[PDB]
Design a protein around this ligand. Structure first.
Ligand SMILES: COc1ccc(Br)cc1-n1cc(NS(=O)(=O)c2ccccc2OC)nn1
Ligand SMILES: [Cl-]
Ligand SMILES: [Cl-]
Ligand SMILES: [Cl-]
Ligand SMILES: [Cl-]
Ligand SMILES: [Cl-]
Ligand SMILES: [Cl-]
Ligand SMILES: [Cl-]
Ligand SMILES: [Zn+2]
Length: 273
């Protein structure tokens, strides 16, 4: 059984990282061809070119809940746009080892990140979120397509997931296990948020305060502070321990970069459930 090993999407040809359970006949051709707008998968260059002349979509379905300059997020309910969401999950599984759901998409909402030009809104990546998470996960799966990786889009989508959690007045954590890139992306985000907050705030913040302010879990704050040498243990409790000196050193170092893209609360049009 030959697996899908290469996709064509828009102007990109991208090699697979992992098995994805596209129907067996789809793996048999040299490439799988995806409409970059509706995510229809096609077996042939000729069916793909036909489709691109006929397909009217120039953006994701659902509602554009965020737009600032040419960066857009669409919110897509798995129940309302099932085929689109299944197509997105099969695409995602080519680049995610640990994603296990592709067809049963109704329980999830999908947040699609696009970069816009005069042709259309071009998919960069997404995250999925359970409508009802028994564990308080604010992200189920998160993926950036290879050509956009390590360019700030992952940090943006993580920031976006916590902006939703903050509007819901809840803490959340990504569902584990995380991708290798995901682990790096999350520690970098958490490090950046915690240091920026400790800098900007006049006076002392606790771990519980930082959790309420950021919607990061106390556990994720603790592991991040451990990585920054900014926490002590005292009679069975983690206690924040930092000087504005050490915060400034971290912010002024090569280990911290200003976010390329930030989430502007003003550009987010979203009411919590
Ligand atoms: C949640 O991130 C992912 C989850 C799954 C998969 Br597959 C990819 C990603 N991801 C993230 C990033 N981009 S970034 O902006 O976070 C970033 C910027 C600078 C340096 C390193 C970075 O990331 C390591 N690109 N891929
Ligand atoms: Cl590639
Ligand atoms: Cl292939
Ligand atoms: Cl459209
Ligand atoms: Cl999954
Ligand atoms: Cl499934
Ligand atoms: Cl990875
Ligand atoms: Cl918590
Ligand atoms: Zn299409």
């Amino acid at each position: 059984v030959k697996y899908v090993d290469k996709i064509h999407i828009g102007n990109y040809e991208i090699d697979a990282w992992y098995f994805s359970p596209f129907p067996e006949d789809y793996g048999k051709q040299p490439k799988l061809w995806l409409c970059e707008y509706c995510l229809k998968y096609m077996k042939y260059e000729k069916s793909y070119r036909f489709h691109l002349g006929q397909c009217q979509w120039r953006q994701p379905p659902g509602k554009e809940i965020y737009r600032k300059s040419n960066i857009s997020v669409h919110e897509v309910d798995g129940k309302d746009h099932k085929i689109y969401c299944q197509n997105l999950c099969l695409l995602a599984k080519l680049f995610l080892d640990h994603k296990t759901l592709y067809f049963d998409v109704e329980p999830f909402v999908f947040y699609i990140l696009t970069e816009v030009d005069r042709q259309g809104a071009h998919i960069v990546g997404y995250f999925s979120k359970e409508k009802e998470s028994p564990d308080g996960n604010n992200v189920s799966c998160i993926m950036i397509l290879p050509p956009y990786q390590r360019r700030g889009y992952g940090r943006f989508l993580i920031a976006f997931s916590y902006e939703l959690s903050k509007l819901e007045s809840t803490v959340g954590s990504p569902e584990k296990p995380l991708s290798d890139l995901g682990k790096l992306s999350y520690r970098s985000y958490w490090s950046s948020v915690l240091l920026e907050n400790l800098r900007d705030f006049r006076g002392t913040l606790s771990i519980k305060d930082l959790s309420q302010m950021t919607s990061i879990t106390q556990n994720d704050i603790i592991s991040t502070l451990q990585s920054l040498n900014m926490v002590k243990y005292w009679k069975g409790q983690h206690v924040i321990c930092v000087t504005p000196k050490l915060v400034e050193e971290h912010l002024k170092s090569a280990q911290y970069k200003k976010p390329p893209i930030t989430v502007d609360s003003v550009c987010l049009k979203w009411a919590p459930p």
